[PDB]
Amino acid sequence: EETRGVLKVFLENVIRDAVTYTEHAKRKTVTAMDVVYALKRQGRTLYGFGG
DNA sequence: GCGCGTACGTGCGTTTAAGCGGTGCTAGAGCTGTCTACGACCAATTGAGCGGCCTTCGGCACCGGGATTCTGATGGGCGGCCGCGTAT
DSSP states (O other), X not given: OHHHHHHHHHHHHHHHHHHHHHHHXXXXXXXXXXXXXXXXXXXXXXXXXXX
């Protein structure tokens, strides 16, 4: 139960960062691309899927 | 170290819902195409900003003068010294 709470914490913040750009971009269908930059912000850079 | 307790791992059976590949639909990203507003650039004038330089009143904490309270030598008067001393 404890971890689910955190998992949620983490998703929330990242998706929070991600969603804004997508809105910024005048679109709904939020991209994988945002998922990542948003991750790069919080400080969890990912190698694999992007740009 | 040791001992008590119990909770969490390992199993089977029951059960529940992910993953698969099948189709359909249209939304929303991506492209594309024309206009023009807003930002860069160059100019000239102006005062906000920085170095240089020294300001004044208020607040913390040390202070100031005057009446008043407590301690000390002074002193006549009632008593006691019993022991040397003059007079008959």
